[model samples]
Target: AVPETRPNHTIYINNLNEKIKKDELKKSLHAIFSRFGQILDILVSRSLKMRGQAFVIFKEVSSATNALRSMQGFPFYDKPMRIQYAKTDSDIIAKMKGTFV
Candidate 1:
């Protein structure tokens, strides 16, 4: 299959296998992206809540793209990072809402 092309700016990182501290993940992300861009929001599942998997929203697309190019495949917290464009909120909502048996 072709590489999934997520939205132009947003991306989702998945398959995190360990708990990660918010402060620590932020530090590592900042080391690669803008320090003051301000993460718009973060939604992490309540479980373990630290497996490094998370939804990070940035104010600017440029910043997201930069993070993707520089951070993907790099080792962090003993695991290589994975980055991709996050789906638009509407798309995800629609998918969730339309599910049926």
Candidate 2:
């Protein structure tokens, strides 16, 4: 069956606090993102396997959209954070073609 629901956008974050502990990073993400709405789930990269970055999923599409519009280029923890709509599965494929070319 075809799906009838979709998110308006996905938010990608960058420029995290390089010194904040992983647990603190997640806590900060939750603290700030919670203002817009409830979070569905979050994927925090493990330091042993990945660098400092976190991806958060909101419970509502509207919440995601609202957060992206407001959170991008905002400063947290004495650093500016980069937030933008994530590339969809299709967008990712398209973007890969244009990288450095």
Candidate 3:
């Protein structure tokens, strides 16, 4: 029998309060996510198509799933965070090097 597989190493987080400052939000995300494991990269976007959304990739799938379960509906800056698995292309991580702060 074959086992089931999933996109378990990346999470898409949205519904952030737009009023929160960029620096604060970035720091907050780091603080919250770092607890689960070593994070490989993070991307936050305010683009018209992706406002208040962030994508996080972890070094391990277990860590990502742990963070997702723990952070779902977690409040941040007066709003709850929406966390879910993110289906991303392989090149996304390569592009993060230029933008991660």
lDDT of each: 0.60, 0.64, 0.71
Q: Which regions of candidate 2 fall more than 4 Å away from where they truly are?
A: 1-10, 46-50, 88-101
**Candidate 1 at residue 80, lDDT?**
66
Best by lDDT: 3
The alpha-carbon deviation from the true structure for residue 31 of candidate 1, after best TM-score superposition, in angstroms, is 6.1
TM-score of 1: 0.60
The residue ranges of model 3 lying beyond 4 angstroms of the native Cα positions read 1-6, 89-101
Model 1 alpha-carbon drift over 4 Å, by segment: 21-33, 47-52, 90-101
Candidates 1 and 3, the one with greater lDDT:
3
Model 2 clash tally, residue pairs:
0
lDDT of candidate 3 over 1-101, digit per residue (tens):
55243556677777777665667767777888888887776767677868677777776677887887778788978776767677763345566657654
Report lDDT (Cα) of residue 80, candidate 3: 68
lDDT of 2 by residue, 34-54 (tens): 898877556567574346466
Q: How are the candidates ranked when ordered by TM-score, highest leading?
A: 3, 2, 1
TM-score (all chains, Cα) for each model: 0.60, 0.66, 0.74
Candidate 2 global CA lDDT score: 0.64
Better of 2 and 3 by lDDT: 3
